[PDB]
Symmetry: none
Subunit: 65 residues, 2 copies
Amino acid sequence: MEQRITLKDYAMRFGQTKTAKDLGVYQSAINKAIHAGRKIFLTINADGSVYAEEVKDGEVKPWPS
Amino acid sequence: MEQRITLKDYAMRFGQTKTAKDLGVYQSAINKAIHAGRKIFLTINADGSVYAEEVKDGEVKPWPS
């Protein structure tokens, strides 16, 4: 089954540094997106590969950009 | 003028590694205090100095000892 977890929750457990590492963006970007309240969720793969998406403008898109 | 923040939150933004460095301590230590729910909080000074204190045994003391 696919497993999803919000960006906030992921950050919460792993901290924003590790999160930044997993997703491959800057910590400033994640703190930014958490503060903004963006609707970002990560889906987790068994290989340990992680990716994020965002619900924005009536659709589900990748995050970032 | 005093700005405080929980070790938890602090570590969450910066990660236990830089936290450890900031307070001068073992990352393992951060780790355990956090898992243990110790009432540790940090105060931030404008020059960039960071210090930790703990509420325990009815007083506010430094951390660690």
